[PDB]
Amino acid sequence: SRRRVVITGMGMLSPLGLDVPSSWEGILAGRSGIAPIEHMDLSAYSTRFGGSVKGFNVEEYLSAKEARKLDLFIQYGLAASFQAVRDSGLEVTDANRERIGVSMGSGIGGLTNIENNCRSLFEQGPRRISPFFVPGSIINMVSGFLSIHLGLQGPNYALTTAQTTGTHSIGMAARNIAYGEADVMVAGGSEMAACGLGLGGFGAARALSTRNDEPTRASRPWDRDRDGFVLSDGSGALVLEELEHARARGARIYAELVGFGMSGDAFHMTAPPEDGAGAARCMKNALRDAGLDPRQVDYINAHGTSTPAGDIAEIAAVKSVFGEHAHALSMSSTKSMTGHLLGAAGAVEAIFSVLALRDQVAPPTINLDNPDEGCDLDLVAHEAKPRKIDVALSNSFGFGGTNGTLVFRRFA
């Protein structure tokens, strides 16, 4: 019968910092991690800025010899995973290694590496493709390499659900534990899609903000002057652990994961429906899964991408799910500061939701100068709002109409 799941460790790389506390400091201070991209020449691109990880040192975690073989999305996923495991205080032993697994996902995976090897193939032939092209680029290799380095022999897999990946990865990992398939899971996601094909491909869809001359103001969820999402890189990992297993080893418990919802819109390849019907179905699934009255919800970490249709669909969904209580909860988009980490978005935003519970503060939606028509909820405009938070919800919505909702609450 279904066991309870708590969060005992967290790890992160974001545009705001090389760990959780540094990133959260930036979140509570309203700081933007968005800047013109320095790592390649984007003068021919319509978008030339994004949320880069600044000053990442892979040699805090791995040999440079092993790092050279791995796409940045794998290096980022391993860094966040290592941080989460260390933060948990868990010791991997012969007695528990079969009960500890990993589900770290990505939306796009090793596009930089695949692009670079495509370059080698086209210009020089197949004999110049890296021997490590496959294991250094495919999405399941965060889970694979983490298992090899720490000796995790539990369920080992990866999700890829576009911008929903980090949320689904955490929810499904919690089900593994809830249903007895594992006692511990390291779960989350990682992304580094800031290569020619990434920026070019989202550019070709006219999905990205083109505010090149004021990049810190580009990400403006629910603002009337928003013009698309900001592309961002990084990773989030959580250690999920069965409650009695956590109690039995004296673990520090940050919060309890009480609810997980999924739904499909079945509407459009890329566009969300204006009424947010699939997001509403997903949130209602999560709240019923958590055994909650919707009025218990205090804080929502929105998907809040800064797209015209996505932002307004989320307002419509929250009003539909929460009715008059929609005016009492606080909802913010931390993508206003971090930009959109795609497959890692749900992983870092799950961490932000847990820290909202720990610190009793709703992070701001920065850049919300002029809320759009019908965007009249408490969206925590400009500045962090200290408040009572017993229940926090984190939403993600992605291409294919794929929705995820996580429900966290304080643990006593």
Can residue 398 be called a binding residue for a second copy (CB under 8 A)?
Answer: yes
- Check residue 232 and report its DSSP letter: B
The span from the CA of 144 to the CA of 152, in Å, is 9
Nearer to ligand NVD, 120 or 270 (CB): 120
- Residues that bind a second copy (rule: CB under 8 A) add up to a total of 87
Pattern 113-132, ligand NVD, x by CB under 6 A: ------xx--xx--------
Shortest Cβ 171–a second copy spacing (Å): 10
Shortest Cβ 196–ligand NVD spacing (Å): 10
Q: Which residue stretch of 41-49, 331-339, 344-352, 389-397 sits at the interface with a second copy (rule: CB under 8 A)? A: 41-49
Shortest Cβ 39–ligand NVD spacing (Å): 13
Binding to a second copy (CB under 8 A): which residues in 183-212? 196-197, 199-207
Binding to a second copy (CB under 8 A): which residues in 109-148? 109, 111, 114-115, 117-119, 121-122, 125-127, 129-135, 137-141, 143-145, 147-148
Nearer to ligand NVD, 42 or 251 (CB): 42
Shortest Cβ 15–a second copy spacing (Å): 20
Helix, strand, or coil (residue 12): strand
- Residues that bind ligand NVD (rule: CB under 6 A) add up to a total of 4
Binding residue for a second copy, selected from 39, 224, 252, 268, defined by CB under 8 A: 268
Long-range pairs of 358-363 with CB within 8 A, sequence gap ≥ 24: 358/254, 358/255, 359/28, 360/386, 360/387, 360/388, 360/389, 361/28, 361/385, 361/386, 361/387, 361/389, 362/299, 362/330, 362/332, 362/386, 362/387, 362/389, 363/27, 363/28, 363/301, 363/332, 363/334, 363/337
Q: What b/e string do you get for 55-78 counting C-beta neighbours within 10 Å, with b at 16 or more?
A: ebebeebbeeebbebbbbbbbbbb
- Number of C-beta neighbours around residue 171 at 10 A: 30
Q: Which residues contact 214 (CB under 8 A, 6 or more apart)?
A: none
Binding to a second copy (CB under 8 A): which residues in 276-315? 278, 281
Nearer to ligand NVD, 46 or 120 (CB): 120
Binding to a second copy (CB under 8 A): which residues in 308-347? none
Give the up-direction half-sphere exposure of residue 232: CA atoms within 13 A in the CB hemisphere: 38
Binding residues for ligand NVD, per CB under 6 A? 119-120, 123-124
